[PDB]
Scaffold this active site. Structure first.
Site, PDB file in Angstrom:
ATOM      1  CB  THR A 163     -33.726 120.427  45.665  1.00 28.06           C
ATOM      2  OG1 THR A 163     -34.338 119.915  46.901  1.00 28.06           O
ATOM      3  CG2 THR A 163     -32.315 121.125  45.802  1.00 28.06           C
TER       4      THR A 163
HETATM    5  B1  LIG Z   1     -34.797 118.503  46.985  1.00 28.02           B
HETATM    6  O1  LIG Z   1     -36.261 118.794  46.721  1.00 28.02           O
HETATM    7  O2  LIG Z   1     -34.371 117.885  46.024  1.00 28.02           O
HETATM    8  C1  LIG Z   1     -34.797 117.904  48.333  1.00 28.02           C
HETATM    9  C2  LIG Z   1     -33.082 118.210  48.805  1.00 28.02           C
HETATM   10  C3  LIG Z   1     -32.871 117.200  50.182  1.00 28.02           C
HETATM   11  C4  LIG Z   1     -31.346 117.360  50.214  1.00 28.02           C
HETATM   12  C5  LIG Z   1     -33.813 117.723  51.507  1.00 28.02           C
HETATM   13  N1  LIG Z   1     -35.125 116.631  48.357  1.00 28.02           N
HETATM   14  C6  LIG Z   1     -36.285 116.224  48.948  1.00 28.02           C
HETATM   15  O3  LIG Z   1     -37.078 116.801  49.285  1.00 28.02           O
HETATM   16  C7  LIG Z   1     -36.550 114.775  48.865  1.00 28.02           C
HETATM   17  C8  LIG Z   1     -37.589 114.311  47.780  1.00 28.02           C
HETATM   18  C9  LIG Z   1     -37.382 114.775  46.610  1.00 28.02           C
HETATM   19  C10 LIG Z   1     -38.206 115.939  45.953  1.00 28.02           C
HETATM   20  C11 LIG Z   1     -37.800 116.242  44.934  1.00 28.02           C
HETATM   21  C12 LIG Z   1     -36.786 115.982  43.982  1.00 28.02           C
HETATM   22  C13 LIG Z   1     -35.886 114.645  44.641  1.00 28.02           C
HETATM   23  C14 LIG Z   1     -36.237 114.374  45.912  1.00 28.02           C
HETATM   24  N2  LIG Z   1     -36.947 114.328  50.075  1.00 28.02           N
HETATM   25  C15 LIG Z   1     -36.064 113.704  51.059  1.00 28.02           C
HETATM   26  O4  LIG Z   1     -34.953 113.647  50.838  1.00 28.02           O
HETATM   27  C16 LIG Z   1     -36.874 113.322  52.347  1.00 28.02           C
HETATM   28  C17 LIG Z   1     -38.054 113.425  52.312  1.00 28.02           C
HETATM   29  N3  LIG Z   1     -38.540 113.229  53.797  1.00 28.02           N
HETATM   30  C18 LIG Z   1     -37.924 113.151  54.846  1.00 28.02           C
HETATM   31  C19 LIG Z   1     -36.352 113.306  54.470  1.00 28.02           C
HETATM   32  N4  LIG Z   1     -35.911 113.456  53.416  1.00 28.02           N
END
Ligand SMILES: *[B]([O])([O])[C]([C][C]([C])[C])[N]C(=O)[C]([C]C1=[C][C]=[C][C]=[C]1)[N]C(=O)C1=[C]N=[C][C]=N1
Ligand SMILES: [Mg+2]
EC number: 3.4.25.1
Lengths: 222, 233, 250, 212, 244, 240, 235, 231
Positions: free
Chosen positions: D1
């Site tokens: 993110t």
């Molecule tokens: B981002 O990478 O932090 C993102 C923002 C979120 C609001 C979609 N988070 C994610 O992709 C998270 C995993 C993660 C990755 C890197 C840092 C922190 C967290 N994934 C999820 O919340 C997720 C995964 N699969 C289905 C639904 N949600």
């Protein structure tokens, strides 16, 4: 130590058309290397032209579907038999899931139906309730095998028009219900070949303005 | 959270044209010790349902008391307790399934695997599974523990899919079950020779068979087997 | 069910009277006479064993009760109310004092705790006041000998000598003439027996009179030897014979 | 993110990516990481999708109730503090959030609050949050001025997310732009990185390392 | 059910008075008179014990004057048992404040706390109020010497000189006549005793019918001493002022 | 717990306990509130039946709820402390969560809400208190003056009085207060407030308290001599 | 004394019937529902001229598509409004949609009979709940302390209710415009009010699908009052 | 008289006056009729309006796909009791995968109403209910009184002037019980029954409310132009 979770395998697939929506799922249920059932329905008609599937840990999946079906019933009682719109159902499911944020329903939930403009709609959830409307979504064991194929063959990703060499994209023409069912069947045939938890049978629920129709197809039983 | 102490092994079952068959051996094991040799693990509920239970025996006995209490409770203020408002296999199962999942959700499970076999009011065969996790599934053949690995393959050769059920007679089905019990005795180190078998037929009702034994066993070929490779004497 | 009487049953009347307390005092007035006299080297408390029937064994009914090894109590009014107060008083001496400080409470503080219990029955929800007046005699190291009266209101006063119940007005006048600050314990017992004879109608002997003292330490009543600092209880109930001996020199 | 937000002459710029991952698996490229709390308030999302979604749409319900009760727009300070106080109650339980609450009011002007699942609440001019925050910070800090045009500010935010989308493996998909002024936020489109990269590379002369 | 027997202790009359508070005040009017007089160099507390006996042990007796802490004391008028409940609560409040802030509790804060407790019994709970009126005599480094009174209503006020209990109307008139602002403790001692001597329902005022106390900065250098007078000391001050 | 329904309806549709609480307010010492163009003044009666009082330590009639809002009252004194305490706590709670001090309207709405809750809660009687709440909203120069009563209703007032003989002083204010041109200065506003109390008070000595509240947390209580100068000037003009 | 939840020999709850008497003493509130919108109007009834009348809030917003007018012990209405606002917002949170006006009204009415020996007495205030939703269009409900609610085409509550209701009986038809309804509320309020009706002692409001719930300015209402006077003098 | 202050007090002749006063609230309520054959069960309810501007108060509530009731008396009490039935019907389905028997539903209502007649502080329910349903033993009709008394009947009526409809049904007993496989004729008989309880007013399009449940008929309510067919 007691482990309250388990993995019942399986795979599900939702595709939103222009005036229809499909929600498919294999009928195989498993633990570890054993088959429990070759035909255990996983996609359910919940009423109000909404179809639902909660793939992963079947006990949590059955519990969630049961509670949502219940929520539809009480929505009618409390709001003068009003039809629960797909967007409203989706938000309701977020609260059901997040209600157990610290002891989650270990499932990947997908619902399908029609929005209030009559267009096809698919919504996708994670185990703790985050959701989003989507055109296309595979869930469960073989989701990683199916989604890339759907990016290519539904959204025409990485496809361009001959002669232009990368300059002009392939136009995003709409897909008929017959065309979508072909892609669903090929997705599950392919998933069955390379994933041990996928097979036995494929059950597809199709949602249109006329109602909910079912189609069943055999899959390889090895 | 606990651990199972006194345990029961496989429960096996299958559908046939006019009903369902279920079977389970009469052993209550205490680890590797084959402690109790007269334990009934098939528990009938009315004349239309038999609940087969594996796993922890103390929890089985608890479930047995819940079912006994369920019959008593259904009879209360119910003039049709022995007719239209009698307990159905589907009612009994859903009750157990509710309890099993509630208990796992409080992190205090009934350490069992349960198969509810029976015949419904309209003559339909009922056969469904539930375990300590609240997981449920139905199939033309169902088995718990070792039965799942060894009995199902044999029983699925008789009824491979739904369309094979009307083609399967009670004689062929019972034969398959009895053979499966023999195989489990050959190969399950926590099984016993003595078992019970129950048939629920839509025409002839509930037939409960006790004190059955595994017979027609092949052991003679053992005499020819010598050493582990090179030994001749 | 549930106790739905969460409101006060004792309330102020237009004249400023607390009716139930006054009526509780009336019940005390009807009760059998009891008295207490304080000497220089001890305290005496006494009352009449008014037996309800000659078939009843009056020895089994104890009007004079030990609260601690150095504190005793007697009453006038409703016997059952007294019995439960003695139970609570004995317990509170342990819970609110002995289990904290490792020693028995001084007379004035145990009296204070009893008073508190009787006050709460005068204000708490769904209860009537206790229908007794207590006379509590006791000794402790820093305050010496002492005698206290406790009323249904929860009010308590220290006395050189006093009487409560049936013939209290006449008995208090009798004590005023006889009491001085140079009385020995035996002299107080003698005066107690004289004062008590006036309010008694029938038999007057060791079997119909209950009398106890707070005096010298009784190592013979301790129950064990080997600890110099533990010298035994100052509370002692006089026997039927011990009373009769002093009735000959009466 | 990768999510960023910064104050400037023309109000606030908010820019986010679109990727969601479960381990190395790309779960979604079309995630809405900005929520429209009302016509004047925006919230960014980073960390757990569910936690951010659930509690920020909840925040919009609390903000609506405030202005129903008080007959007045809720302040950015008050709105951000409702969220931070809420997550602080859940501290230790395992919530995973990194959010910017962005708004504009008369009394405050353009305001940004960084709110955090550890309970951290910080007011500031520039914030970048997420796995690709460091990449976005590079572009921002070297090109940021107070006197930027709405057009130039919007581009800087777009470019900063692109920078992170390229380098950070857990960022990408597309760029969602928002511009916050007195009169509410204004959406400025979804920009696919697969097309934006080749466009920016060609026009800007950047990314000479990559072959195109 | 139980409603039948409920006196409803916490209701207004048609005139807007609290029945039970008014009747509690009537109860207090029959209690022994207590007087407080504040001077520039200290405070006096004087109080009359109610019709005593010759057999009452006076030197170990306490019905009127109580110590809340080293700086604050109270004179009681009303039900003694009710007063002791409140006194123990007040003693605890003072210690809670000392533990929290590591400073002795200001007089008014303690008075407000006890007064708020009394108030509670007039508004909720369905219980009878405390039939007690206090005179608070105390010192702190903010306001110096302070006199307060509280009554069953939970209302409190500050005073230069004040009486509670019996014959307050007569007592307050006498105090209002002879009190002056530049008065000293020794003069206030005399005023308190002279006032009781005239308002008393007894034939004569003697040492055995009195409790007496002074809060003085008459303690060696900048500090405050509480003096609860002994029977012999009350007898001496009665001779000194020329009453006996 | 004590659950008895003390505040209930009567056949004619009245809640007598609430109405009898108003009678307690009628008994209380008079309190008056007047708002000028750039200020609000709170006047309060002190009954001179109590002399030998220590005025340094005696609870003052006007209470600061925050640095920018004040509260005066008529009725039961002990009851008013409970409302004041709750209000002061809510004032700090509002600063803590909203990061902004309470508006005068919000604080009034809270106090009024508490008073209402006590009219339909089991086991409790209504507050025998009516309040005048005055002050200035944060960063606002518009004067605010509100009134509450036992029932829980509240409303804003250009000028208002409560307590004993409040009918008389309200009569005075209704003819003497002009809305088109309110007391332009502090002097004019205080003068009108003292004048209104002089219709009821008796002696203008230690029987009148005056508290002036100005914008931006500028609150001050006038002394005896300062008030006495207003009393002197009013009667000297009256001798004509 | 006697129970708070006691039945009379006629089969009515004493306390509920007594609370209805309190509502009769309240200031008049009128509602008129049309196909172009619902109009809500109230009598402010200031007790004194020094009372700033714009602080009298007897018409209240529950949500953007639901408004509410009150009559009786108006202090009691505050917790009902708070519940209504919470219910409306909560439902939007759970279902991502507006709540039906009937469902909102039902939720408010569920509080009504939660009294005993829960709150100690019924509410002493009646509510006119007006709003719009997609299913049943423009609606007007009358919520009582009995827990009952009736839907109305037009309704008056308060001291001048039966006189106003008889007037609404004659005047209402299914083809009323919004402008016609506004004047009609003003006309009937003026009839039953003690004091002379103007923009300071009376208040108007409406709920339309497009603009939602709006309380009218004193300048806007003043024009509608002037428009009323002229059309009554026209014949 | 002296024994009607609360529900916890018997009179000297063994009567509970608060319960009888609650029974009186039903008699003030608008008329409603219930009747059944072997295949179907029908509810017919005369709705009451406040005035001409007002709507007509709804009288029929659905409890499940196979069960529902009509009310007469305090409507909020009917909402409480119908809500309880909805939950009990639902508990039966979720836990036992079993549709709740109409007889057992009556037993549950009886016991809920009883607790309010024996305890201090509470009050009896002020509403009468007519429950219809179709379960495993065919069509059923129940009559609930807030005294707790529940009765299974072929037909009945409650509310004001209900005696006229009850007499009609008592005459027609042999006819309407035989109306099997014909919903419209069974409703006609119900509409004709409720007509015996009308005075001055007649059955209009927004006045009449009808509900039906049967063998292959889920519990459905008919209002508005849907009942013009039967007027
Ligand atoms: B981002 O990478 O932090 C993102 C923002 C979120 C609001 C979609 N988070 C994610 O992709 C998270 C995993 C993660 C990755 C890197 C840092 C922190 C967290 N994934 C999820 O919340 C997720 C995964 N699969 C289905 C639904 N949600
Ligand atoms: Mg496979």
């Amino acid at each position: 130590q007691f482990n309250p979770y388990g993995d019942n395998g399986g795979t599900i697939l939702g595709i939103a058309g222009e005036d229809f929506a499909v929600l498919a799922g294999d009928t195989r249920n498993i633990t570890d290397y054993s088959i429990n059932s070759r035909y255990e329905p996983k996609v359910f008609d919940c009423g109000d032209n909404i179809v639902m599937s909660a793939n992963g840990f079947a006990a949590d999946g059955d519990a969630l579907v049961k509670r949502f079906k219940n929520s539809v019933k009480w929505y009618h009682f409390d709001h003068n038999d009003k039809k629960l719109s797909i967007n409203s159902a989706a938000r309701n499911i977020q609260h059901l899931l997040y209600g157990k944020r610290f002891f989650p329903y270990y499932v990947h939930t997908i619902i399908a139906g029609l929005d209030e403009d009559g267009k096809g709609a698919v919504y996708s959830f994670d185990p703790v309730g985050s959701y989003e409307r989507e055109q296309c979504r595979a869930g469960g064991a073989a989701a990683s095998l199916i989604m890339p194929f759907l990016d290519n063959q539904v959204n025409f990703k990485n496809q361009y028009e001959p002669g232009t060499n990368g300059k002009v994209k392939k136009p995003l023409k709409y897909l008929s219900v017959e065309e979508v069912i072909k892609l669903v069947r090929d997705s599950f045939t392919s998933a069955t070949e390379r994933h041990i938890q996928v097979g036995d049978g494929l059950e597809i629920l199709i949602v249109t303005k006329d109602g909910v129709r079912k189609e069943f197809y055999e899959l390889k039983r090895d | 959270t606990q651990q199972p102490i006194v345990t029961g092994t496989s429960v096996i079952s299958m559908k046939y044209d006019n009903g369902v068959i279920i079977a389970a051996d009469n052993l209550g094991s205490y680890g590797s010790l084959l402690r109790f040799n007269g334990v009934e693990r098939l528990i009938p509920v009315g004349d239309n349902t038999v609940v087969g239970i594996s796993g922890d025996i103390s929890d089985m006995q608890h479930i047995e008391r819940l079912l006994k209490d369920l019959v008593t409770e259904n009879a209360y203020d119910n003039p049709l307790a022995d007719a239209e408002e009698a307990l159905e296999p589907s009612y009994i199962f859903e009750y157990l399934a509710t309890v099993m999942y509630q208990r796992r959700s409080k992190m205090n499970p009934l350490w069992n695997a349960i198969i509810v076999a029976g015949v419904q009011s309209n003559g339909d065969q009922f056969l469904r599974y539930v375990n300590l996790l609240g997981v449920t599934y139905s199939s033309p053949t169902l088995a718990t523990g070792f039965g799942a690995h060894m009995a199902n393959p044999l029983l699925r050769k008789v009824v491979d899919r739904e369309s094979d059920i009307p083609k399967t007679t009670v004689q062929v089905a019972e034969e398959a079950i009895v053979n499966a019990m023999r195989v489990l005795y050959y190969r399950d180190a926590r099984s016993s020779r003595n078992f019970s078998l129950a048939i629920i037929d839509k025409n002839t009702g509930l037939t409960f068979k006790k004190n059955l034994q595994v017979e027609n066993m092949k052991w003679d070929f053992a005499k020819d087997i010598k050493g582990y490779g090179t030994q001749k004497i | 069910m549930t106790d739905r009487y969460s409101f006060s049953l004792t309330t102020f009347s237009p004249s400023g009277k607390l009716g139930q307390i006054d009526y509780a005092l009336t019940a005390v007035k009807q009760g059998v006479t009891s008295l207490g006299i304080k000497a220089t080297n001890g305290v005496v408390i006494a009352t009449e064993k008014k037996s309800s029937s000659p078939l009843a064994m009056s020895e089994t009914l104890s009007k004079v009760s030990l609260l601690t090894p150095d504190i005793g109590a007697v009453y006038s009014g409703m016997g059952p109310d007294y019995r439960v107060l003695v139970d609570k008083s004995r317990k509170v001496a342990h819970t609110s004092y002995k289990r904290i400080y490792g020693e028995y409470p001084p007379t004035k503080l145990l009296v204070s705790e009893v008073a508190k219990i009787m006050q709460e029955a005068t204000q708490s929800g769904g209860v009537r006041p206790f229908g007794v007046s207590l006379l509590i005699a006791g000794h402790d190291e820093f305050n010496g000998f002492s005698l206290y009266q406790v009323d249904p209101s929860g009010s308590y006063f220290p006395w050189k000598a006093t009487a409560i119940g049936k013939g209290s007005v006449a008995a208090k006048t009798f004590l005023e003439k006889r009491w001085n600050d140079e009385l020995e314990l035996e002299d107080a017992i003698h005066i107690a027996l004289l004062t008590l004879k006036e309010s008694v109608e029938g038999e007057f002997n060791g079997d119909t009179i209950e009398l106890a003292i707070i005096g010298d330490e009784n190592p013979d009543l301790l129950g064990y030897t080997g600890i110099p600092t533990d010298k035994g209880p100052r509370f002692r109930k006089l026997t039927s014979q011990e009373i009769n001996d002093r009735l000959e020199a009466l | 993110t990768t999510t960023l937000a910064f104050r400037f002459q023309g109000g606030i710029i908010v820019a986010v990516d679109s990727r969601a991952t479960a381990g190395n698996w790309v779960a979604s490229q079309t995630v809405k990481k900005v929520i429209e709390i009302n016509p004047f308030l925006l919230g960014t999302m980073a960390g757990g999708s569910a936690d951010c979604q659930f509690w920020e749409t909840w925040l919009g319900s609390q903000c609506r109730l405030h202005e129903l009760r008080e007959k007045e727009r809720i302040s950015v300070a008050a709105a951000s503090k409702i969220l931070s106080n809420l997550v602080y109650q859940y501290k230790g339980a395992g919530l995973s959030m990194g959010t910017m609450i962005c708004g504009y009011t008369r009394k405050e002007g353009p305001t940004i609050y960084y709110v955090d699942s550890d309970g951290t609440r910080l007011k500031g001019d520039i914030f970048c949050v997420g796995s690709g925050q460091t990449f976005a910070y590079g572009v921002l800090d070297s090109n940021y001025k107070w006197d930027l045009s709405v057009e130039d500010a919007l581009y800087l935010g777009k470019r900063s997310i692109l920078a992170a989308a390229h380098r950070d493996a857990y960022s990408g998909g597309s760029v969602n732009l928002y511009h916050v002024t007195e009169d509410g936020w204004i959406y400025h489109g979804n920009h696919d990185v697969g097309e934006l990269f080749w466009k920016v590379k060609e026009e800007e002369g950047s990314f000479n390392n990559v072959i195109g | 059910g139980s409603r039948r027997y409920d006196s409803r202790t916490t209701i207004f009359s048609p005139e807007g008075r609290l029945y039970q508070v008014e009747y509690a005040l009537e109860s207090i009017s029959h209690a022994g008179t207590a007087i407080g007089i504040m001077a520039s160099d200290g405070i006096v507390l004087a109080a009359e014990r109610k019709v005593t006996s010759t057999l009452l042990e006076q030197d170990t007796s306490t019905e009127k004057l109580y110590k809340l802490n080293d700086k604050i004391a109270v004179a009681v008028a009303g039900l003694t048992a009710d007063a002791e409940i409140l006194i123990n609560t007040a003693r605890i409040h003072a210690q809670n404040y000392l533990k929290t802030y590591n400073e002795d509790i200001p007089v008014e804060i303690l008075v407000r706390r006890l007064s708020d407790i009394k108030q509670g019994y007039t508004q909720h709970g369905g219980l009878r109020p405390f039939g007690v009126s206090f005179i608070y005599a105390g010192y702190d480094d903010r306001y110096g010497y302070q006199l307060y009174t509280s009554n069953p209503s939970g209302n409190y006020t500050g005073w230069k000189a004040i009486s509670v209990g019996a014959n307050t109307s007569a007592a307050q008139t006498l105090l209002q006549m002879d009190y002056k602002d530049d008065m000293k403790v020794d003069d206030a001692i005399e005023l308190a005793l002279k006032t009781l001597s005239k308002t008393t329902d007894s034939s004569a005022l003697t040492y055995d019918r009195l409790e007496f106390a002074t809060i003085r900065k008459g303690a060696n250098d900048g500090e405050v001493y509480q003096k609860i007078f002994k029977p012999q000391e009350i007898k001496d001050i009665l001779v000194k002022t020329g009453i006996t | 717990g004590y659950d008895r329904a003390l505040s209930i309806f009567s056949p004619d549709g009245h809640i007598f306990q609430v109405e009898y609480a108003l009678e307690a307010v009628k008994r209380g010492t008079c309190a008056v509130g007047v708002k000028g163009k750039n200020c609000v003044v709170l006047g309060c009666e002190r009954r001179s039946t109590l002399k030998l009082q220590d005025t340094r330590i005696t609870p003052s009639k006007v209470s600061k709820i925050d640095s920018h809002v004040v509260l005066s009252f008529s009725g039961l004194n002990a009851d008013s402390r409970i409302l004041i305490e709750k209000a002061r706590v809510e004032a700090q709670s509002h600063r803590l969560t909203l990061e902004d001090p309470v508006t005068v309207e919000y604080l009034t709405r809270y106090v009024a809400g508490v008073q209402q809750r006590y009219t339909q809660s089991g086991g409790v009687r209504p507050f025998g208190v009516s309040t005048l709440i005055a002050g200035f909203d944060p960063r606002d120069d518009e004067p605010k003056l509100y009134q509450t009563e036992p029932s829980g209703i509240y409303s804003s007032w250009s000028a208002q009085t409560i307590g004993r003989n409040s009918k008389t002083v309200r009569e005075f204010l209704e003819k003497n207060y002009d809305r088109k041109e309110p007391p332009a200065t502090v002097e004019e506003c205080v003068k009108l407030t003292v004048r209104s109390l002089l219709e009821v008070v008796q002696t203008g000595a230690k029987n009148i308290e005056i508290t002036v509240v100005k914008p931006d947390s500028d609150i001050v209580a006038l002394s005896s001599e300062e008030i006495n100068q207003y009393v002197t000037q009013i009667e000297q003009e009256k001798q004509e | 004394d006697r129970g708070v939840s006691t039945f009379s020999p006629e089969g009515r709850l004493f306390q509920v019937e007594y609370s209805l008497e309190a509502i009769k003493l309240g200031s008049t509130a009128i509602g008129i529902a049309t196909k172009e919108g619902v109009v809500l109007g109230v009598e402010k009834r200031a007790t004194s001229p020094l009372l700033e009348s714009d602080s009298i809030e007897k018409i209240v917003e529950i949500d953007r598509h639901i408004g509410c007018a009150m009559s009786g012990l108006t202090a009691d209405a505050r917790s009902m409004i708070e519940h209504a606002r919470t219910a409306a917002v909560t439902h939007n949170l759970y279902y991502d949609e507006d709540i039906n006006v009937e469902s909102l009204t039902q939720s408010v009415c569920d509080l009504a009979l939660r009294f005993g020996e829960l709150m100690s007495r019924p509410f002493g205030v009646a509510l006119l709940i007006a709003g719009h939703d997609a299913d049943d269009g423009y609606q007007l409900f009358h919520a009582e302390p009995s827990g009952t609610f009736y839907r109305y085409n037009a309704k008056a509550i308060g001291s001048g209710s039966e006189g106003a209701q008889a007037e609404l009986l004659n005047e209402w038809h299914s083809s009323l415009t919004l402008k016609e309804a506004e004047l009609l509320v003003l006309k009937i309020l003026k009839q039953v009010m003690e004091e002379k009706l103007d923009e300071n002692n009376a208040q108007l409001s409406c709920i339309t699908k497009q603009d939602g719930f709006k309380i009218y300015d004193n300048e806007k209402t003043a024009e509608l009052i002037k428009e009323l006077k002229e059309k009554e003098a026209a014949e | 008289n002296n024994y009607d202050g609360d529900t916890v007090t018997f009179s000297p002749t063994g009567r509970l006056f608060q319960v009888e006063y609650a029974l009186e609230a039903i008699k003030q309520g608008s008329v409603t009729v219930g009747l059944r054959s072997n295949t179907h069960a029908v509810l017919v309810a005369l709705k009451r309006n406040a005035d001409e501007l007002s709507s007509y108060q709804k009288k029929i509530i659905k409890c499940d796909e196979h069960m529902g009731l009509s009310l007469a008396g305090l409507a909020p009490d009917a909402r409480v009791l119908s809500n309880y039935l909805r939950q009990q019907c639902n508990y039966s389905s979720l836990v036992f995968n079993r549709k709740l028997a109409v007889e057992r539903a009556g037993h549950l209502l009886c016991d809920k109403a009883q607790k309010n007649t024996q305890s201090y502080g509470g009050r009896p329910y002020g509403v009468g209910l007519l429950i219809i349903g179709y379960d495993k033993s065919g069509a059923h009709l129940l009559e609930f009184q807030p005294s707790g008394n529940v009765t299974e009947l072929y037909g009945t009526a409650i509310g004001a002037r209900s005696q006229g409809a009850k007499t009609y049904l008592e005459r027609t007993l042999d006819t309407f019980i035989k109306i099997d496989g014909n919903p419209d004729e069974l409703i006609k008989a119900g509409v004709e029954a409720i007509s015996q309880s009308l005075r001055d007013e007649s059955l209009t399009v927004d006045n009449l409310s009808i509900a039906i449940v049967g063998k292959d008929t889920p519990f459905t309510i008919y209002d508005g132009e849907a009942v013009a067919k039967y007027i």
